[PDB]
Amino acid sequence: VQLAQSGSELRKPGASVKVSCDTSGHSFTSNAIHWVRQAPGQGLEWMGWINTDTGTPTYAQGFTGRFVFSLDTSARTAYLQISSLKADDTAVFYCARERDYSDYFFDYWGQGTLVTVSS
Amino acid sequence: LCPFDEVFNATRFASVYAWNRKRISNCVADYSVLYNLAPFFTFKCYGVSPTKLNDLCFTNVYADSFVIRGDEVRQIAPGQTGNIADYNYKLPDDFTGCVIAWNSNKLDSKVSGNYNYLYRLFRKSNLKPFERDISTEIYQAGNKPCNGVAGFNCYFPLRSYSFRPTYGVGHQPYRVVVLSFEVCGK
Amino acid sequence: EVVMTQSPASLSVSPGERATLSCRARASLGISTDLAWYQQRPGQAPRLLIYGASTRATGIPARFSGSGSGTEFTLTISSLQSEDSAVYYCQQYSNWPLTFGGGTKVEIK
Ligand SMILES: *[C@@H]1O[C@H](CO)[C@@H](O[C@@H]2O[C@H](CO)[C@@H](O)[C@H](O)[C@H]2NC(C)=O)[C@H](O)[C@H]1NC(C)=O
């Protein structure tokens, strides 16, 4: 219920950021691990998901092109790639994993990784 | 506008033997959102040309959605025979509409096997067009009555698809949406 | 996409008083009880309160009772405590623009 992600990270505009999400703390009967973005003041925004053991990523309407989902060789930890960071891309990126298969609500949530775009 | 994205993008698709039927009435139907999507691997239309859908008005539009494997996608057509056509979903010989199917291996397949999708294997007689049979009575394949007890020559009519990612293209799950025409395009 | 209009945008109700949170979705055909209620206390990550329209997640107290079906959904919290002052989001797992709600800031008088 407390999937371990990576820590907060400061990246200059135009750089790239690596966000991890360790999932091996529990046993999951699901093939999907979802990514949720929360702005520093606004609400939750669903980014997409990546298919575990298949590696096929899916993105939302506004989170495509610069956002890349990737998995591990062991298909446990899921990585998040943001390239060409803008000054408005600072946010907290939550890693959500559903408990049962095809139950698309997120019982298990990550601690949250806050990327900051400044100088 | 018409709620096509409530139909094609829905998370839950029903098994083929219990296919859903969604009413689409009193709306503007823009069918150009269907053509220009990369994953739709079968946009087949019967009696209407696909490029002329935006110029036609229909009194009702019914969207039947279900999940089958790739090998029986060809079975969803007027005048077709087999397990899906005869026992699960029959299209009339004078069917006027479009059949849309796309591979959903990332959504409906599980490495340990997705048993959630069922199809009807045994039935006394072939289904009439657009007829739905959700009965799960024990099929009597022989002479001795089953009395609701499965066993020898007493088969449960429903079977499980067992979708897995490692299966071949023909064995992967396919999400099928059938549009029935008989709602003005713009 | 299915867009939620979660209202009121901010509540302020006394402890021990029912707080009704509503989440309407702009879905033509409806959701049919495919709604999930989350709770994000300041700081910590969101916690799944109610999956589906009515049934609650494991470990959730009986106060968090859910309701609604199709388009109009309502979450009620009975006998609020100081630890229920959080932000509540609603999600549809019906289509695949999975969308969260705008959120409701619940405040204790
Ligand atoms: C189902 O949802 C997908 C998004 O996951 C829609 O795909 C988008 O469609 C719009 C046009 O309507 C395009 O501008 C986007 O680029 C598409 N995004 C992706 C990721 O494909 C799709 O249109 C929806 N289905 C229907 C019938 O509207």
Numbering used by the authors:
A (entry chain H): 2 to 120
B (entry chain R): 335 to 516, 524 to 527
C (entry chain L): 1 to 109
What does the paper say about this structure?
The Omicron variants that have emerged more recently contain similar RBD sequences to BA.2, with the addition of L452 and F486 substitutions—L452Q in BA.2.12.1, L452M in BA.2.13 and L452R/F486V in BA.4 and BA.5—and exhibit a transmission advantage over BA. We expressed and purified the prefusion-stabilized trimeric ectodomains of BA.1, BA.2, BA.3, BA.2.12.1, BA.2.13 and BA.4/BA.5 spike (S-trimer).
Group E1 occupies the S309 binding site, whose epitope involves G339, T345 and R346. Similar to S309, the epitope of group E1 antibodies includes an N-linked glycan on N343. Group E1 antibodies are also generally sensitive to mutation of G339, E340, T345 and especially R346, as indicated by their escaping mutation profiles. The N343 glycan is critically recognized by almost all group E1 NAbs, including S309. In addition, our recently developed non-competing antibody cocktail comprising two NAbs isolated from vaccinated individuals who had recovered from SARS, namely BD55-5840 (also known as SA58; class 3) and BD55-5514 (also known as SA55; class 1/4), displayed high potency against the Omicron subvariants and the sarbecoviruses SARS-CoV-1, Pangolin-GD and RaTG13.
